[PDB]
A paper describes a structure:
PRPP is formed from ATP and D-ribose-5-phosphate (R5P) by the phosphoribosyl pyrophosphate synthetases (PRSs). The human PRS family, which has 3 isoforms (hPRS1, hPRS2 and hPRS3), belongs to the class I PRSs that requires divalent metal ions such as Mg2+ as the activator, inorganic phosphate ion for activity, and ATP or dATP as the diphosphoryl donor. Due to the important role of PRPP in the nucleotide metabolic process, the stability of PRPP content is essential for cell physiology and is predominantly controlled by hPRS1, the ubiquitously expressed human PRPP synthetase. Mutations in hPRS1 affect vital cell functions and are related to many diseases and disorders.
2− complex was determined using the MR method to 2.0 Å resolution. More information about the 2.0 Å resolution structure could be found in the supplementary materials (S1). 2− complex structure, the β9–10 strands from Arg196 to Val202, with missing electron density, are possibly structurally and functionally similar to the same region in the Thermoplasma volcanium PRS-R5P complex. We also found that the highly conserved residues Lys194 and Arg196 (located between the β9–10 strands) exist among all 3 classes of PRS. The second motif with conformational change, termed as the flexible loop (from Ile89 to Ile107), exists among all known PRS structures. According to the crystallography symmetry operation, the PRS1 crystal structure appeared as a three-leaf clover like hexahydric ring that matched the apo state of the PRS1 3D-EM structure. We then reconstructed the 3D- EM structure of the PRS1 apo form, which displays the 3-leaf clover structure that matches the PRS1 hexamer model derived from the crystal structure, according to the crystallography symmetry operation. Based on the EM results and the crystal structure, the functional hexamer might be the most efficient functional form. The surfaces of active centers and interfaces are highly conserved according to our surface conservation analysis.
Residue numbers in the entry:
A (entry chain A): 3 to 195, 203 to 313
B (entry chain B): 3 to 195, 203 to 317
Write the structure that this text describes.
């Protein structure tokens, strides 16, 4: 009844999920014709089935989005009973408002496309902005890595009871005060005027930079420099989505991070060979459990 | 009231169209981010304007499509009066049916995406299947290269009154009979079974292979061989959309074509440097006219049989 399919070549997360559910990944032929068009071909009947498509990680965000939309549509017109998009890192999430510019709200565009493609349900993790659930009219389950992150901090940072959770920017305030409050410790915040300004106390204490995602890491690496300058004993960086593109990886080694922790919402195995301070939190069990619970009418909010 | 924007940095067609309309291309900040995400920023107000966005021919179809969708979205939420997508070569057009398989109808998906992004109108040329117009509820103007192709044939092939128009496959039948009937000449059809068969006489005549598009060119190259074997004097290939990916340019250089004729719905300039057989028909005037007619409420259908 449950059928799980994986996006293009990135399959490791998808395989882990299927394993936990006692399933094999559904048969599908996903490629790219010589002329760049995405080719998809569902290799088995999905009629009457509860279908979950786990987004890919072939890096190329537009190819991965189109492959997902095409797979959703194929399953819908092949009479699946329901189609859920499992998208650990939601594409174009940062493009979720105009920001005083004549800009697209591409996150809303992405939501409309998923909907017209035929998605009945979305499962995702740590939306850049919670309001993004409002971009849909279908149910969205937005899972949190927070519980996983707290666990990791307690278990890996000896001085954690007196650390400071630090936001790399002004916009990250809510996220870090949330974490600092759960741990009952201090928080502080960095803002780029450029020069960086720090508000809050970090002197002589472990500093943990926490962010929903890191891309070029230019901001997170500068922040690390600032924190050292302000006398933080040691600096960590905790990111739920480790995009790590461009100079990211070399900026990290080249930085003072005692470690950089991310989830496997994005494949990491390649960059871990090029960066020793990277540790990953496996979130396949959360995702698998969201799917089973989604399938069984069981509570998903428990995992929050 | 009229504002024309180009996708990407492959603005040659876009600039040719703007030029013909007496306009500059609208200002857009259009970059791909670190993590592959497309960035777009409309650099001027489009409020109350009749906006036309011309699809870029970069090559990476998924990037070009998303860029277009994002530009449509930006203009719509910036209160343009109307947004028309000008898509010279329609993406995923060859994915317009199931073909007895558990396949997506990706062309219908593309139409839905264009529609939800907010397109009010589509202008395109030579849809792979005319039924694709039915994939929308908004109006689509599907322009034809045929008038420009007929003119090219009459002005470049001495023996056109005695030639045969040839379809490279079963699905191109109507397209070639249409041309053959207008020229008042014969037609022929190739069908691939791992072998080609030809129905229709081409012996001791010039043969013109006509198709909507050529991609890797395996088919037209094999078709030309076949036609020469059947006694054609020589072989031309005329396509509206020259995708020419993979080994196409190599295949063409080795093929027994006298010439391969395409339109500029897809950029050809770089391809031509490596392939002297390619000749290009400029369709910018046809597109510019469809846009001008559309803005003015004048007849676009005039263009279906007449070269502006």
């Amino acid at each position: 009844n449950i059928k799980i399919f994986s996006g293009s070549s990135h399959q490791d997360l998808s395989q882990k999920i299927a394993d936990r559910l006692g399933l094999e990944l559904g048969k599908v032929v996903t490629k790219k014709f010589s002329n760049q068009e995405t080719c998809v071909e569902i290799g088995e009947s999905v009629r009457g089935e509860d279908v979950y498509i786990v987004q890919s990680g072939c890096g190329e965000i537009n190819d991965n989005l189109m492959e997902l939309l095409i797979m959703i549509n194929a399953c819908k017109i092949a009479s699946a009973s329901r189609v859920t998009a499992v998208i650990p890192c939601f594409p174009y999430a940062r493009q979720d408002k105009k920001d005083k510019s004549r800009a697209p709200i591409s996150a809303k565009l992405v939501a409309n496309m998923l909907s017209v493609a035929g998605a009945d349900h979305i499962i995702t993790m740590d939306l850049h902005a919670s309001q993004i659930q409002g971009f849909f009219d279908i149910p969205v389950d937005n899972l949190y890595a927070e519980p996983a992150v707290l666990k990791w901090i307690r278990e890996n940072i000896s001085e954690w009871r007196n650390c400071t959770i630090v936001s790399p920017d002004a916009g990250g305030a809510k996220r870090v005060t949330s974490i600092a409050d759960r741990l009952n410790v201090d928080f502080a915040l960095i803002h780029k005027e450029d020069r960086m300004v720090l508000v809050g106390d970090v002197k002589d204490r472990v500093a943990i930079l926490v962010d929903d995602m890191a891309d070029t890491c230019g901001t997170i690496c500068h922040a690390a420099d600032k924190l050292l300058s302000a006398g933080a004993t040691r600096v960590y960086a905790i990111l739920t989505h480790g995009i790590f593109s461009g100079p990211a990886i070399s900026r990290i080694n080249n930085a003072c991070f005692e470690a950089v922790v991310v989830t496997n919402t994005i494949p990491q195995e390649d960059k871990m060979k090029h960066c020793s301070k990277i540790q990953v939190i496996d979130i396949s069990m959360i995702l698998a459990e969201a799917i089973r619970r989604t399938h069984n009418g069981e509570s998903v909010s428990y995992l929050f």
